[PDB]
Amino acid sequence: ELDQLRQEAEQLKNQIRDARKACADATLSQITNNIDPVGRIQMRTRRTLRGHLAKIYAMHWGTDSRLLVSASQDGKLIIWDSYTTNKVHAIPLRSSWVMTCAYAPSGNYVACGGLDNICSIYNLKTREGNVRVSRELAGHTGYLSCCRFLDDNQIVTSSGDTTCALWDIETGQQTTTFTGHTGDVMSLSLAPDTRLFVSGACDASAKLWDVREGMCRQTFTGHESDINAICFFPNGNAFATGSDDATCRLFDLRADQELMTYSHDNIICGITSVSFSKSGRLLLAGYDDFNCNVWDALKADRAGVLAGHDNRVSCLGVTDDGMAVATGSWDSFLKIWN
Amino acid sequence: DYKITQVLFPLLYTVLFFVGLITNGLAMRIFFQIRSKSNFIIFLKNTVISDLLMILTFPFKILSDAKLGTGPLRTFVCQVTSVIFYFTMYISISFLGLITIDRYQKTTRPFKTSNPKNLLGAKILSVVIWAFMFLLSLPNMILTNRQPRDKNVKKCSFLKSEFGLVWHEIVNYICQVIFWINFLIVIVCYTLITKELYRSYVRTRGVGKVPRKKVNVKVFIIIAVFFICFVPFHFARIPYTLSQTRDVFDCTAENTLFYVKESTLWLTSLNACLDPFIYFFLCKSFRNSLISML
Amino acid sequence: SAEDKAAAERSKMIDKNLREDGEKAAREVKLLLLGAGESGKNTIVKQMKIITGIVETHFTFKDLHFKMFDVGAQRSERKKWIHCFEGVTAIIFCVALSAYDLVMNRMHASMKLFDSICNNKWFTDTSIILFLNKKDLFEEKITHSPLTICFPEYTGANKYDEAASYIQSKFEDLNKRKDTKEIYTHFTCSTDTKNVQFVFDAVTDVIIKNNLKDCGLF
Amino acid sequence: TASIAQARKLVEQLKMEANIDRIKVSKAAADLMAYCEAHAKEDPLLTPVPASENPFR
Ligand SMILES: CSc1nc(N)c2ncn([C@@H]3O[C@H](COP(=O)(O)OP(=O)(O)O)[C@@H](O)[C@H]3O)c2n1
């Protein structure tokens, strides 16, 4: 019974590993020698957004590439105007422990959550007066790792309860439950088509999930440590996973292969945030060595360093058009780089 | 002509100078690197600035003392360099007292936080005391208009007018009162701080003793530095002021008077390089920063 | 430029409000509770605190505002969210005195939990307010059951005063720093305004050290 | 039954996840490079744009 099932699972696992090995005929780095590397890239702090008074853990850009939102442990979620360096909004949080921050594609709702197991979504319009509570999703038993808005009526939240949840804003209750992981989830990102999103947990694997059906598409057991940073490639056919062993691994969906990794001797610390560029050529990762790295997604070499912070990095963001990059590292400060 | 051993004496200063020249330098980049988090940071920055000014004034003093003409260099040193050294050392005294007061307030009232308004008030007080010391030192620099009557002697007590002399005596009296007030305040506040730490420890831990002596041995270092390097100078300052202004002391007493006054002045000047050392020995974060620098 | 002026005025007002809120938060004391579910952690809460993963308890003592935090409902990995408790005034660790023979022993489980908390990179300078609660039950339980079954290292005789004092010292040796972190140990009692009195003193002690560490005295 | 239901679910999921169609890694790399070169011109990060039209100057 149990022994037979375990043996069958092991046999099929080695079979799928052999199939993946046979599929990988040529690595990306072997054929990347044709393209000219971008080389050194210089990026400076254009704006220093200094309004927070605690350790910032998460942020997100708007679709307008101008209005962002940031979350720290001061119990304040601050919607910032990156252009004029002003606070468009500042909304108090009932729970100071917040680790996620998502912004609605239309810009009307903003979500925040953390150790309180409750994802609070607040309306940014509030034409009737001051800001007010809009929705409070309470269905998770974990620390509510990350959340992402699909639209004004759907939000996907991955929590520390080893499960993911897709909710509905109008109903206020969980609609879809994603149960494929063995360890608790830490971060997830949505694809451009908002129909197939990847999720990273601490069991050293990244799992795909469909919004409609809810079943798991693909699983990548590439890393050997906990995965805490993940983001989609701009096309939607690839993504990157960042673990605490200084490893950023690129995984393709259709190929379903371990493609290429950011293994370097200088980096020994962990990773917290991973993002991409508008064209996807630049992969912007955040390491525990108090500065962020900008790797070339193809040449497998480092291209830029964002050493302006004085603490562990927690949140990275890149606009849809790649106009600017926002970095927030445990110092109540946001830095804008171009 | 006191003795030829005078030439040996500024050598101590240069031994005091070179190391000092780096110690404040070590405190120049580390103290200013961190932001103005509290009033103690501002006071420490002002203190290290005063120590750097001391280091800047030292080579002029050693050049005047070792070998130099009365006209070209001794008058310049006695006119501005000496006076700026004195009021900068008084500023360092005042800022040490302010640091002690801040520590006493943080110990007796731990729950009170430092607001931006408090930092602004501390900066205003720093500017006010700086301007006050400069204002009292200005007559000591502008009233020395008399030309050197004698070239053989190096004592510049005659290069000052009668009103200059009476204002000099008034400045000495006022600064002695200020130093005594600051010294008693520092002693009282440190004793109260030690008492408060002992009371807190016996309330929380009870009859423990091993860590209780850790704060006692570090507080005494500050007290010892402020005592053996500032207080003997002010014991010997009053007779020197009386000898310079009045003629109540005879000729042969001037030798030992100058000897003890200049030795106490060297002890006071040692504080310029001592304060970086004691402040790095006290705070562990400064040691971590210094190690990371190397 | 009327819109720009209005935006600047709104930003200035928001900054003033945020500064006021930050001052209010810094004036208050944050304490993190840790331990086991059956170690008596909930006993301390239901004593005088008149005023779902985190149970936030706020009470005022001697014109000082406190904020208790409970992580018992967080049934996940601790190291993925234990870094969010930076800057806490102290850690309130509750361990039961009578839980030395319950079964993989309860005391060994608490010591292993205490070892990770006391020797982690996130609480190197954060003091721990150790609580050896349920001392009343420890009086009638020491005689029946000795500490030999928990560990053979207890050469001393089994007595209520001797065992409780010695088991207190069983937690400081787990601390490797012993310089930046000070463990405050107290035995809870039913005396009115006595258990919370120690917390106020322990918070004052660590704050004084914190208020002097940045002042150069430590 | 309860101790084996999760094992059955896991093995069934791992079995039916292997029925998807997979392309060669070379084709995926070619598509990634083509997409990178297609939007390379319209990428401020790769090509530093002049400050005249830069909204962050
Ligand atoms: C506020 S700055 C200050 N404070 C004093 N207590 C002072 N006592 C004396 N001075 C001036 O310091 C310089 C040299 O000190 P003195 O002991 O008066 O004369 P010397 O024995 O030749 O050094 C002269 O320019 C004096 O006018 C002082 N300057």
Author numbering:
A (entry chain C): 3 to 340
B (entry chain A): 20 to 313
C (entry chain B): 6 to 56, 183 to 234, 241 to 355
D (entry chain G): 6 to 62
Question: How is this structure described in the published paper?
Answer:
In P2Y1R and P2Y12R, the agonist 2MeSADP exhibits different binding poses and the binding sites only partially overlap in the diphosphate region. In contrast, the adenine group penetrates deep into a narrow binding cavity within the receptor transmembrane core when bound to P2Y12R, forming extensive interactions with helices III-VI. Alternatively, the 5ʹ-diphosphate group is engaged in two salt bridges with R933.21 and K2807.35 and three hydrogen bonds with Y1053.33, Y2596.58, and Q2636.62 in helices III, VI, and VII of P2Y12R. In contrast to P2Y1R, where the receptor activation is regulated mainly through repositioning of residue side chains within the ligand-binding pocket, P2Y12R modulates its activity in a more global way. Compared to the antagonist AZD1283-bound inactive structure, the extracellular ends of helices VI and VII display large inward displacements upon binding to 2MeSADP. This conformational change in the extracellular binding pocket is most likely associated with the outward movements of helices VI and VII in the intracellular region, and thereby creates a cavity for G-protein accommodation. Lacking the conserved residue P5.50 (N5.50 in P2Y12R), this helix exhibits a straight conformation with rigidity that facilitates relaying the conformational change in the extracellular region to the intracellular side. Thus, the conformational change of helix V in the ligand-binding pocket is likely linked with a movement of its intracellular region towards helix III, which enables its interaction with the Gi protein. For P2Y12R, the residues L3017.56 and C3028.47 in the linker region move towards the C terminus of the Gα α5 helix, packing tightly against the main chain of G353G.H5.24 in Gαi2.
Thus far, eight human P2YRs have been characterized and are classified into two sub-families based on their sequence homology and signal transduction mechanisms, including P2Y1R-like receptors that signal preferentially through Gq/11 proteins and P2Y12R-like receptors that activate Gi/o proteins. P2Y1R and P2Y12R, which recognize the same endogenous ligands ADP and ATP, play vital roles in platelet aggregation, making them attractive drug targets for the treatment of thrombotic diseases. P2Y1R activation initiates shape change and activation of the platelets, while P2Y12R activation further amplifies this process and results in platelet aggregation. Thus, we solved the fully active structures of P2Y1R and P2Y12R bound to the agonist 2MeSADP and different classes of heterotrimeric G proteins, G11 and Gi2, respectively (the antibody scFv16 was used to stabilize the G11 protein).
